Amino acid sequence: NLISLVNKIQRACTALGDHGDSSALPTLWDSLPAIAVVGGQSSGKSSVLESIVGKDFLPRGSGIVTRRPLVLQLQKIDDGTREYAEFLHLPRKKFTDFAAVRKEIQDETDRETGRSKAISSVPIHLSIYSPNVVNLTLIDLPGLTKVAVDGQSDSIVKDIENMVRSYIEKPNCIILAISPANQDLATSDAIKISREVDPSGDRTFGVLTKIDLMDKGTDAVEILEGRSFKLKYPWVGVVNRSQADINKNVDMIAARKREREYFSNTTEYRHLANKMGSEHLAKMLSKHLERVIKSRIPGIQSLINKTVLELETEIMERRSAISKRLELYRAAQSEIDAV
Amino acid sequence: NLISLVNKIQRACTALGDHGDSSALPTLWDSLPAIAVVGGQSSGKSSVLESIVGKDFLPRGSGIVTRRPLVLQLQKIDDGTREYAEFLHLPRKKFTDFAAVRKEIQDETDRETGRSKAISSVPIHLSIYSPNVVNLTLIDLPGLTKVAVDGQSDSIVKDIENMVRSYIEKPNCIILAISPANQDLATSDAIKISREVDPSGDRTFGVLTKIDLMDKGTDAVEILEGRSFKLKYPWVGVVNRSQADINKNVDMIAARKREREYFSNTTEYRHLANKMGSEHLAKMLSKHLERVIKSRIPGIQSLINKTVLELETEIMERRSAISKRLELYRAAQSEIDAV
Numbered sequence: 001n002l003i004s005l006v007n008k009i010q011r012a013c014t015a016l017g018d019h020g021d022s023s024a025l026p027t028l029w030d031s032l033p034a035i036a037v038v039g040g041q042s043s044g045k046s047s048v049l050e051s052i053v054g055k056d057f058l059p060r061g062s063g064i065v066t067r068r069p070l071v072l073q074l075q076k077i078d079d080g081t082r083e084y085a086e087f088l089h090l091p092r093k094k095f096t097d098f099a100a101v102r103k104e105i106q107d108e109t110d111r112e113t114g115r116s117k118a119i120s121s122v123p124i125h126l127s128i129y130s131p132n133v134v135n136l137t138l139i140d141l142p143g144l145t146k147v148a149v150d151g152q153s154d155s156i157v158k159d160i161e162n163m164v165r166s167y168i169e170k171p172n173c174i175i176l177a178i179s180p181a182n183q184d185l186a187t188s189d190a191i192k193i194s195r196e197v198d199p200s201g202d203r204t205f206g207v208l209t210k211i212d213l214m215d216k217g218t219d220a221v222e223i224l225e226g227r228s229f230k231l232k233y234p235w236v237g238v239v240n241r242s243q244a245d246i247n248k249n250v251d252m253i254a255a256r257k258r259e260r261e262y263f264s265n266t267t268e269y270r271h272l273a274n275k276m277g278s279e280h281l282a283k284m285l286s287k288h289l290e291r292v293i294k295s296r297i298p299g300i301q302s303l304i305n306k307t308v309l310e311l312e313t314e315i316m317e318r319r320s321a322i323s324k325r326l327e328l329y330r331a332a333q334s335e336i337d338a339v
Numbered sequence: 340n341l342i343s344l345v346n347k348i349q350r351a352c353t354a355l356g357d358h359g360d361s362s363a364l365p366t367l368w369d370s371l372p373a374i375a376v377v378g379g380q381s382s383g384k385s386s387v388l389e390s391i392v393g394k395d396f397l398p399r400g401s402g403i404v405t406r407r408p409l410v411l412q413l414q415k416i417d418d419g420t421r422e423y424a425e426f427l428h429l430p431r432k433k434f435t436d437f438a439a440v441r442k443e444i445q446d447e448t449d450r451e452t453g454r455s456k457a458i459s460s461v462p463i464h465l466s467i468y469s470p471n472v473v474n475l476t477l478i479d480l481p482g483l484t485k486v487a488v489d490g491q492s493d494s495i496v497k498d499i500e501n502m503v504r505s506y507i508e509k510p511n512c513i514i515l516a517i518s519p520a521n522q523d524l525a526t527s528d529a530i531k532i533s534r535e536v537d538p539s540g541d542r543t544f545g546v547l548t549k550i551d552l553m554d555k556g557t558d559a560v561e562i563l564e565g566r567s568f569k570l571k572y573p574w575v576g577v578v579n580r581s582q583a584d585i586n587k588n589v590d591m592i593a594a595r596k597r598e599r600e601y602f603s604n605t606t607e608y609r610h611l612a613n614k615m616g617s618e619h620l621a622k623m624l625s626k627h628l629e630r631v632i633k634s635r636i637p638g639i640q641s642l643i644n645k646t647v648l649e650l651e652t653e654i655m656e657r658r659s660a661i662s663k664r665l666e667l668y669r670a671a672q673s674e675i676d677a678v
């Protein structure tokens with residue numbers, strides 16, 4: 001629920017104070033103890049924010065059809081199966097039919113970019129509350145490429161590793177390196193960049209998607225044993241919904257009763273079985289973020305010090321401006337204060 | 340045959356031509372119409388060459404082992420099966436137990452590296468003679484990585500990049516861009532770092548790999564028909580042995596077999612498998628070298644240039660040893676003049 005402080009903040013911020021108000025960008029930054037999820041194209045980010053949401057909602061692209069930021073805030077709810085989700089985009093309105101919030105996304109995206117990729121680097125706040133998922137805060141970054149293909153441009157190349165390394169440079173968001181597993185990890189565009197900033201591992205968890213489709217006479221152990229690309233935390237093995245199934249329409253729900261069936265009932269990791277899977281990770285993520293948020297709230301006094309550099313310190317273009325620039329930091333306190 | 344000469348030549352240069360003369364070692368480089376196999380760690384490189392040689396012979400590369408620019412030469416022999424292979428590493432001696440070759444390759448490497456992955460840059464002149472090969476000259480090449488793993492210092496990564504880029508830069512050199520089907524080509528460290536040196540896509544040929552290891556769902560109808568990531572030439576895709584196979588020590592000869600009926604009996608691909616086989620890469624390359632050379636061989640004045648720049652060289656450590664360049668440079672042109 002604390003994870004939802006950041007969110008109860010956060011939004012009410014890119015609600016107005018997404019300007020960068022001389023010194024009112026100083027929040028969606030520190031305030032962003034919130035995992036960033038990176039994965040070079042075809043990695044699997046697109047999917048794991050669907051089995052960590054146990055519901056569709058992303059416009060599917062095994063190449064790329066998601067070319068934006070994306071602040072995904074979750075929230076458990078009192079077992080009263082009122083699912084739904086909102087948007088800062090569309091104010092005070094509610095969705096239900098996820099498969100058409102997977103068109104709204106596909107549509108806000110299209111209000112600048114295209115059918116085959118352009119440039120747009122300003123967030124997309126969507127909060128999903130759902131009885132059967134974990135209180136948390138994600139931010140989707142688009143896949144990481146090195147070959148400028150089609151009627152794309154040729155900065156797309158170093159313009160995505162731009163975007164990425166600057167939602168990553170921020171010493172607050174935790175890195176989440178999705179690196180599929182029919183390729184070596186000594187090749188992770190993810191890990192390569194995950195190590196660029198944070199050679200320390202202080203923020204950074206391994207994901208490693210796709211294994212059912214990994215080789216034969218190979219398997220996945222020495223990472224979830226943590227012996228090859230040993231990570232400061234551990235690694236977390238997932239099985240998402242194969243291409244095989246996304247076309248077969250497969251629900252998200254009985255999808256997880258499938259990845260379950262996997263490691264519990266597949267010789268090779270029948271023993272690692274319990275620290276693996278969508279359902280799990282989250283429980284973990286949320287846990288390792290809460291610590292983070294928590295252990296980082298005397299961003300009060302460091303919150304509570306950028307107020308009087310205003311409130312008690314006053315053509316008139318910035319007086320027509322500090323009329324926004326403050327409400328934020330004040331809406332801030334109470335939103336903490338309270339609980 | 341026109342090829343076999345190039346081989347027959349370079350063995351001679353860098354048989355004493357590895358320290359050059361500060362203005363006449365563009366001559367292995369010069370004499371380099373030859374294919375360089377340029378793929379990223381674990382791509383397929385190795386497993387492919389064994390498929391171009393019908394035999395085993397290779398240090399196994401999931402945990403890499405060939406980090407010596409192995410200049411692999413092949414030559415054809417009339418249908419009397421004196422199969423035999425011979426090194427420069429050791430003048431006049433011949434081989435048979437192929438693993439005894441594979442043992443030697445990985446016995447020299449160890450002299451110039453370690454066992455937990457290190458670096459050096461002299462070549463390796465392992466040559467092979469057989470009915471079942473087409474005349475070729477590869478220089479195999481270190482696998483393009485992007486994460487210094489474990490005991491590799493760090494400068495390791497971007498030090499392989501400039502080594503792979505080196506053979507490659509040379510305008511008479513070909514490129515074997517090996518890249519596996521189970522990852523969106525827009526993350527081919529290969530295609531990326533090919534199109535680097537060769538924006539003309541003129542001396543690059545395509546190579547899919549691991550296609551049985553693709554996902555029940557997707558396939559490659561699109562790249563082989565050359566309608567997705569087209570080159571200039573057709574894209575040949577193949578099925579070397581999988582870990583799986585290397586374990587039951589799947590007799591090499593059982594290679595080509597395997598895939599043929601794969602490629603033949605597969606619907607998706609069916610109609611292509613005559614322009615597709617492993618065997619038919621060699622053929623298709625060895626025929627493409629021919630032209631390459633008969634094109635360039637007026638790089639016969641690249642010589643009469645240095646033999647003109649030294650014939651007129653008009654303690655005694657150079658002189659007496661300049662002529663041991665000419666007579667081992669010059670009469671190469673007479674060995675070219677010849678045919």
Ligand SMILES: Nc1nc2c(ncn2[C@@H]2O[C@H](COP(=O)(O)OP(=O)(O)O)[C@@H](O)[C@H]2O)c(=O)[nH]1
Nearest residue numbers: 041042043044045046047061062210240242243
């Ligand atoms: N079978 C299987 N397929 C996967 C897995 N992860 C990703 N894929 C497939 O990869 C393709 C798209 O990956 P995507 O979710 O879009 O990741 P992204 O391309 O990096 O955004 C689809 O075929 C996915 O089903 C997995 O764990 N198992």
Ligand SMILES: Nc1nc2c(ncn2[C@@H]2O[C@H](COP(=O)(O)OP(=O)(O)O)[C@@H](O)[C@H]2O)c(=O)[nH]1
Nearest residue numbers: 381382383384385386400548549578579581582
């Ligand atoms: N099934 C299958 N497996 C492959 C293919 N190519 C490579 N492999 C496997 O991929 C792994 C690495 O291949 P390898 O040749 O050693 O990579 P490289 O030598 O660094 O290019 C090994 O386990 C191989 O058995 C292929 O075309 N099909």
